[PDB]
């Protein structure tokens, strides 16, 4: 909510600057590879009719947002878990500890994990994420929704990812860095500081996707509240 309103302001500001109408567009001068995200969604699978939405983060951790609004996350060590209930209660445990209260959901999570590992490509596989406190909280998927053109994924660290179905382009927006990472059709990745994009401008494709992004963040804030 705090991070989302900040994201909305940052997007309203860049779009208000009409970055694609600059007489001298200099997109490259808005890049800042130091702002590369730590986390993004590399895979997802929509089983919402029965169980929920499963996903994998670029660090090979997996998570599930169950239909009952709980979330279960399995770290990339294959054993550490974080469970978040609908009221917000979080717990840390291990699969190997055999938690009686969670074996069904662990089994479902493992089903999701095996589906994605065998069938799906890893988004951003050509990217080494930024170095953070590898030591600090793994985010979880706070909410998601689909439109006819994209899937919108909102992470608990405030990031918002939008994957476009038609051309496989993707945006990863981070309100903490006020940055956007754009993955184009050719899977080339560029990270921009939004404030620099306002000075230097950008191409019509990125400008259009950023207008769409503002609309989706607007929808995210409205549904939350």
């Amino acid at each position: 909510a705090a991070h989302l309103s900040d994201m909305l302001q940052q997007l309203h500001s860049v779009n208000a600057s009409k970055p694609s109408e600059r007489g001298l567009v200099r997109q490259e001068e808005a890049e800042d590879p130091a702002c590369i995200p730590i986390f993004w969604v590399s895979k997802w699978v929509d089983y919402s009719d029965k169980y929920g939405l499963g996903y994998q983060l670029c660090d090979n951790s997996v998570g599930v947002l169950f239909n009952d609004s709980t979330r279960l996350i399995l770290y990339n060590d294959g054993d550490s878990l974080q469970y978040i209930e609908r009221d917000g209660t979080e717990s840390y445990l291990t699969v190997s500890s055999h938690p009686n209260s969670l074996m069904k959901k662990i089994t479902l999570l493992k089903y999701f994990r095996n589906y994605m590992s065998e069938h799906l490509l890893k988004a951003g596989a050509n990217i080494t994420p930024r170095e953070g406190d590898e030591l600090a909280r793994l985010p979880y998927l706070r909410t998601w929704f689909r439109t006819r053109s994209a899937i919108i994924l909102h992470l608990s660290n405030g990031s918002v990812q939008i994957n476009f179905f038609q051309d496989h382009t993707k945006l990863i927006l981070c309100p903490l860095m006020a940055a956007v990472t754009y993955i184009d059709e050719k899977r080339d990745f560029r990270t921009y500081r939004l404030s620099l994009l306002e000075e230097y401008g950008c191409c019509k494709e990125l400008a259009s996707r950023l207008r769409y992004a503002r609309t989706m963040v607007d929808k995210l804030l409205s549904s939350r509240s």
């Binding site: 969604v41 895979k43 699978v45 490509l121 988004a123 496989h168």
Partner: peptide
Amino acid sequence: PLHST
């Protein structure tokens, strides 16, 4: 789409 690429 029911799943990513």
